[PDB]
Amino acid sequence: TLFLATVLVSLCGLVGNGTVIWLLGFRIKRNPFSVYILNLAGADFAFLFCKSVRFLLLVLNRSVAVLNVLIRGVTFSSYLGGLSLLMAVSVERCLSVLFPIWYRCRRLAQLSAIACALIWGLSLCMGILVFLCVHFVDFLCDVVNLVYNGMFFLTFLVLCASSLALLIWVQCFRIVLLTVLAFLVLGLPLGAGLLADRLSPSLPCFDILLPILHLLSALNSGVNPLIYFFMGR
Amino acid sequence: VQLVESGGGLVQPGGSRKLSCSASGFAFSSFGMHWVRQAPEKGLEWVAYISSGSGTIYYADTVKGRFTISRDDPKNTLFLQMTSLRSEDTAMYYCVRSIYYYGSSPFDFWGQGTTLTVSDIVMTQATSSVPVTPGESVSISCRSSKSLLHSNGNTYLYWFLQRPGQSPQLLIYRMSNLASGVPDRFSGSGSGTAFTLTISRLEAEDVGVYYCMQHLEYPLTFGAGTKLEL
Amino acid sequence: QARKLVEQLKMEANIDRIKVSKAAADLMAYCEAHAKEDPLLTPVPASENPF
Amino acid sequence: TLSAEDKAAVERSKMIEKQLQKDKQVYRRTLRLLLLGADNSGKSTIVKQMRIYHKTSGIFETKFQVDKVNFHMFDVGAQRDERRKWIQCFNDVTAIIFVVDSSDYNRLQEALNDFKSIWNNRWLRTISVILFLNKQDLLAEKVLAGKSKIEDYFPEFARYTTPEDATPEPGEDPRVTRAKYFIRKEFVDISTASGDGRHICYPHFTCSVDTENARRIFNDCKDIILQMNLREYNLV
Amino acid sequence: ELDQLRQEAEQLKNQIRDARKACADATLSQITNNIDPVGRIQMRTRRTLRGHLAKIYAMHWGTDSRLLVSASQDGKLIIWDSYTTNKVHAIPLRSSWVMTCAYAPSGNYVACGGLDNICSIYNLKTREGNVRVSRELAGHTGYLSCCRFLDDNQIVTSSGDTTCALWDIETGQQTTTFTGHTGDVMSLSLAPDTRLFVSGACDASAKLWDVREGMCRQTFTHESDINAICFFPNGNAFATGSDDATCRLFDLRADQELMTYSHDNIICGITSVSFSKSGRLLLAGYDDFNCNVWDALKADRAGVLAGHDNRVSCLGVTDDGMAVATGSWDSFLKIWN
Ligand SMILES: COc1ccccc1/C=C/C=O
């Protein structure tokens, strides 16, 4: 009976990501971190845009499922991407306590909008690869899955080594501890989801689990907007 | 303001020549600049236009492809590179200063010109010559095939005067405004597709050929010009 | 240095004031006469508004 | 729908935009500082010191750069005593440099009042103050004579003992440092009475012969920038 | 004899007060009580101008109700085209601290001034094609707070030295000095006939001056600094917005305080004051980041602009009444209609 409820929060994730879109992007003034949050909000809005759309096509029963190709097609990007954005924010914040004058004064105003658009320019281009190589297949194109996993592992390790660096600096400088760690909390489910997707076949039992697991997924995308508001307002 | 051009002479047909006009005495970098020409015994004809910042270049149809306009802002000099010359391209080439903002008076200053000899909103000015005696009012009229009253509110007609043996001097910009340094006796009036220039109390040292030029759309078309003789 | 104050204040004292009623009437009359002239009071139609 | 002239005007506007973006980068990369003090305070000495080594005109300006960071320091002359009206132009200055002559005890009390007016100003409520207790070669020569005791002007000095904190490492008479720290605390108390964001007073001891004042200004301004980063970007 | 002079001055001030009270038979609210209220004046931000880099301290419209000059602390003086948002000029100032900007009635010159104590008059119709500093009037001993043009050759400038000045631009000299105020003169409004002007200062008092003769005709008295002043369109009244939330309307012919525009929910100070073309609307900018539109006769609030993120520092209504331009301490100007 879960699918009835999950669509609602999935809708509400939108009632939210959509607002942050406005608050961070169009209402408050742009700040280096704004652009990153904005991209995080836009990506989620989308992984949810197609999601809730499939959900409606299914209830409607007008069914095609070439949609499904895309939804899992770019799935590998809410990850190399979202985790890369989170790494970018964490590194920028560690550069804004180590290099205050540089960050406030001599930093390219559009360096956020080059980092963003580079992360995507080499994240989708890397996730389309895994979608084209684990589904359709070429023999040694499969070393690519290792690359994604190496790039993913490096991004997570840099995220941690940056967030831990910031927290070790702040103690040496209850809600400030959550602001300094606001991004490791949100890039924890990204690694969790990637690990689930890659290691699901190891113990595959998501047939009797997807209806309930997707409630957790939608709940993540619905609690995400409040975290972007607590981390960029 | 001074603007002296050089590079003319004899060019055998099919050749190539670089006309360069050097601008001294004004902010060259902040002014759009035009190249116009006058055939040996004919009217003015717009050739090219290079905008301030070199971001918008326009050419005439009979000029496109063969001629490249460019400007060197630090050296304060604009160049027209003419390639594959023809016999119809012989003319005195004038370099025309022109700024564009609200209230601006484009086509203020004109150079002395370079003689180069090679061995469409049509604007009609029916009066090819108007006899006159000093001290009496004159009216020079020209029409247009397309109304020049843009929706913004101002009609884009420019009245120029070319005294014998001198460069053209702007008289009226936008069909009613009087240029800087032109006597108050000159007046402009009319509506779209019908314009009249009135000189009250005509006083010699203002006889010569009067031209009317459109600026609503590129290319800019001139007229034959009425020749006022004393 | 203090005689300037007394002279200026004497010049300011000997002025021909009018009753506040007449001044108020004049302001009200000016506002009524030029009522249909300012777009801010009576909004001009969007055709005649250049903004 | 625009005419040819309208398009040209728009292109001119975009060129002006481009020069304005370049000027924005220049304006951002430079740090504005405002220098205040009394006539007694050694204040032109400090501008000379950071210039050499790095009419009725009102505003005096002093470029100086420390570690490739440009500073525009503004001194306000040819103005009357009341400053509540032109002080609003400095709501965006990185720091206000206040120079107080530690030598003159008689005029010290009004120096604290000027400092209080600057600190508790509705427009400088977010502007840090770099404080220079200047003319301390004169302070030592004044306190080592015994002919001018702070108790004659500040009654609370007799009951003040130097704190268990950083004494001046070089050779300094232990009550020279007592007087110096009392002067310092008289300003730090006013600073900490009403504190907020971006509003922290950095006290420093300086002299005319001191050539490290620009370095002190750079360090304090770096800390101010760090605080604005920690605050504007929500890291605190 | 200073006691005797002070006693005579006190007696004369009491005579002035008694005479001014003898002509206050009715209050403006009593006469206005019958005319219908304006109603909700809802004005929307039509054009927003996004060029400056720092706080805008002043604007002034042109007499064509199309061009406007804005002065910012970034050292820029931008001449904007209101209709198209186009930037016509961007003058770089020699001093970045500018508190005033003036647009000449003819459109040829534009004036700036600030902490430099200099009134810089720039020429816009030069054959060279670039704006040049035509003149630098350099006689003040304090910051410039307001400059207004009389014609192309005369300017009137209020300064922090407690004095106003009337300068002949070509000679570069102060033709006349006005020397009554006891505090910094912060604003200045020129009468439509350009024979008189009212200056508001920090002594909580406005003063009406005869330009041709140099004297101070009348002195009107507020309980804090007068930051903005603006003549009524009639030429027989004016409005002063002060640091105490209050905009007061005085009348020259009666030497009185006709009305006091205030609200208990307004605590900030008024920075700018302007009148609608009819004179019925008094627009005032506030430190609360928004402009309040008062009904100049019923003394009741009529509307709120409320579109700025920082304090409104300048306000100006065009000659045709078509728009009210507000400039705040964020870079932006907003054209309300
Ligand atoms: C289905 O994978 C997951 C399992 C638990 C939590 C999160 C995810 C992935 C979410 C998408 O980003």
PDB file of N, CA, C and O in Angstrom, chain B residues 80-101:
ATOM      1  N   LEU B  80      39.924  50.632 -44.177  1.00  0.00           N
ATOM      2  CA  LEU B  80      39.053  49.945 -45.120  1.00  0.00           C
ATOM      3  C   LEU B  80      39.955  49.234 -46.117  1.00  0.00           C
ATOM      4  O   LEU B  80      40.629  49.885 -46.923  1.00  0.00           O
ATOM      5  N   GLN B  81      40.001  47.910 -46.031  1.00  0.00           N
ATOM      6  CA  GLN B  81      40.777  47.090 -46.949  1.00  0.00           C
ATOM      7  C   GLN B  81      39.872  46.715 -48.109  1.00  0.00           C
ATOM      8  O   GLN B  81      38.897  45.980 -47.931  1.00  0.00           O
ATOM      9  N   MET B  82      40.182  47.225 -49.291  1.00  0.00           N
ATOM     10  CA  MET B  82      39.368  47.022 -50.473  1.00  0.00           C
ATOM     11  C   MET B  82      40.068  46.003 -51.359  1.00  0.00           C
ATOM     12  O   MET B  82      41.212  46.219 -51.769  1.00  0.00           O
ATOM     13  N   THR B  83      39.380  44.901 -51.648  1.00  0.00           N
ATOM     14  CA  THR B  83      39.924  43.799 -52.427  1.00  0.00           C
ATOM     15  C   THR B  83      39.090  43.591 -53.681  1.00  0.00           C
ATOM     16  O   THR B  83      37.861  43.688 -53.642  1.00  0.00           O
ATOM     17  N   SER B  84      39.768  43.299 -54.790  1.00  0.00           N
ATOM     18  CA  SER B  84      39.129  43.067 -56.084  1.00  0.00           C
ATOM     19  C   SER B  84      38.323  44.296 -56.513  1.00  0.00           C
ATOM     20  O   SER B  84      37.098  44.277 -56.624  1.00  0.00           O
ATOM     21  N   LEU B  85      39.060  45.374 -56.746  1.00  0.00           N
ATOM     22  CA  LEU B  85      38.437  46.642 -57.083  1.00  0.00           C
ATOM     23  C   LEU B  85      37.800  46.584 -58.463  1.00  0.00           C
ATOM     24  O   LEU B  85      38.199  45.802 -59.327  1.00  0.00           O
ATOM     25  N   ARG B  86      36.788  47.420 -58.657  1.00  0.00           N
ATOM     26  CA  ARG B  86      36.105  47.552 -59.929  1.00  0.00           C
ATOM     27  C   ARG B  86      36.105  49.015 -60.341  1.00  0.00           C
ATOM     28  O   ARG B  86      36.505  49.898 -59.580  1.00  0.00           O
ATOM     29  N   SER B  87      35.651  49.271 -61.566  1.00  0.00           N
ATOM     30  CA  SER B  87      35.590  50.640 -62.057  1.00  0.00           C
ATOM     31  C   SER B  87      34.494  51.451 -61.385  1.00  0.00           C
ATOM     32  O   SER B  87      34.581  52.679 -61.357  1.00  0.00           O
ATOM     33  N   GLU B  88      33.465  50.798 -60.858  1.00  0.00           N
ATOM     34  CA  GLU B  88      32.392  51.512 -60.182  1.00  0.00           C
ATOM     35  C   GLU B  88      32.765  51.930 -58.774  1.00  0.00           C
ATOM     36  O   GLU B  88      32.014  52.687 -58.152  1.00  0.00           O
ATOM     37  N   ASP B  89      33.896  51.464 -58.258  1.00  0.00           N
ATOM     38  CA  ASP B  89      34.321  51.785 -56.909  1.00  0.00           C
ATOM     39  C   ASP B  89      35.182  53.037 -56.849  1.00  0.00           C
ATOM     40  O   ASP B  89      35.666  53.387 -55.772  1.00  0.00           O
ATOM     41  N   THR B  90      35.386  53.716 -57.974  1.00  0.00           N
ATOM     42  CA  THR B  90      36.108  54.978 -57.950  1.00  0.00           C
ATOM     43  C   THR B  90      35.260  56.040 -57.274  1.00  0.00           C
ATOM     44  O   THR B  90      34.077  56.196 -57.587  1.00  0.00           O
ATOM     45  N   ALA B  91      35.863  56.767 -56.339  1.00  0.00           N
ATOM     46  CA  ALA B  91      35.122  57.767 -55.585  1.00  0.00           C
ATOM     47  C   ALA B  91      36.083  58.523 -54.685  1.00  0.00           C
ATOM     48  O   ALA B  91      37.235  58.128 -54.490  1.00  0.00           O
ATOM     49  N   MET B  92      35.588  59.627 -54.140  1.00  0.00           N
ATOM     50  CA  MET B  92      36.192  60.244 -52.974  1.00  0.00           C
ATOM     51  C   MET B  92      35.577  59.576 -51.756  1.00  0.00           C
ATOM     52  O   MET B  92      34.360  59.656 -51.548  1.00  0.00           O
ATOM     53  N   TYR B  93      36.404  58.884 -50.987  1.00  0.00           N
ATOM     54  CA  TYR B  93      35.951  58.165 -49.813  1.00  0.00           C
ATOM     55  C   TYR B  93      36.080  59.061 -48.593  1.00  0.00           C
ATOM     56  O   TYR B  93      37.150  59.621 -48.332  1.00  0.00           O
ATOM     57  N   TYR B  94      34.980  59.207 -47.867  1.00  0.00           N
ATOM     58  CA  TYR B  94      34.914  60.003 -46.658  1.00  0.00           C
ATOM     59  C   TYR B  94      34.750  59.077 -45.469  1.00  0.00           C
ATOM     60  O   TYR B  94      34.056  58.060 -45.548  1.00  0.00           O
ATOM     61  N   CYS B  95      35.395  59.432 -44.375  1.00  0.00           N
ATOM     62  CA  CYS B  95      35.238  58.733 -43.116  1.00  0.00           C
ATOM     63  C   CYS B  95      34.390  59.592 -42.196  1.00  0.00           C
ATOM     64  O   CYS B  95      34.713  60.759 -41.965  1.00  0.00           O
ATOM     65  N   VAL B  96      33.311  59.023 -41.677  1.00  0.00           N
ATOM     66  CA  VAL B  96      32.297  59.790 -40.973  1.00  0.00           C
ATOM     67  C   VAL B  96      32.250  59.344 -39.524  1.00  0.00           C
ATOM     68  O   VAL B  96      32.125  58.152 -39.229  1.00  0.00           O
ATOM     69  N   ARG B  97      32.363  60.307 -38.629  1.00  0.00           N
ATOM     70  CA  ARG B  97      32.264  60.085 -37.203  1.00  0.00           C
ATOM     71  C   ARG B  97      30.801  59.931 -36.815  1.00  0.00           C
ATOM     72  O   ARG B  97      29.934  60.632 -37.340  1.00  0.00           O
ATOM     73  N   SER B  98      30.509  59.024 -35.880  1.00  0.00           N
ATOM     74  CA  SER B  98      29.114  58.868 -35.491  1.00  0.00           C
ATOM     75  C   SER B  98      28.937  58.166 -34.154  1.00  0.00           C
ATOM     76  O   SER B  98      29.249  56.982 -34.030  1.00  0.00           O
ATOM     77  N   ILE B  99      28.405  58.868 -33.162  1.00  0.00           N
ATOM     78  CA  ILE B  99      28.086  58.276 -31.871  1.00  0.00           C
ATOM     79  C   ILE B  99      26.590  58.027 -31.807  1.00  0.00           C
ATOM     80  O   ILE B  99      25.804  58.638 -32.540  1.00  0.00           O
ATOM     81  N   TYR B 100      26.194  57.109 -30.930  1.00  0.00           N
ATOM     82  CA  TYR B 100      24.798  56.718 -30.794  1.00  0.00           C
ATOM     83  C   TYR B 100      24.447  56.564 -29.322  1.00  0.00           C
ATOM     84  O   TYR B 100      24.888  55.614 -28.670  1.00  0.00           O
ATOM     85  N   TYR B 101      23.660  57.501 -28.808  1.00  0.00           N
ATOM     86  CA  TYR B 101      22.991  57.371 -27.523  1.00  0.00           C
ATOM     87  C   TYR B 101      21.743  58.238 -27.583  1.00  0.00           C
ATOM     88  O   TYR B 101      21.412  58.796 -28.630  1.00  0.00           O
TER      89      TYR B 101
END
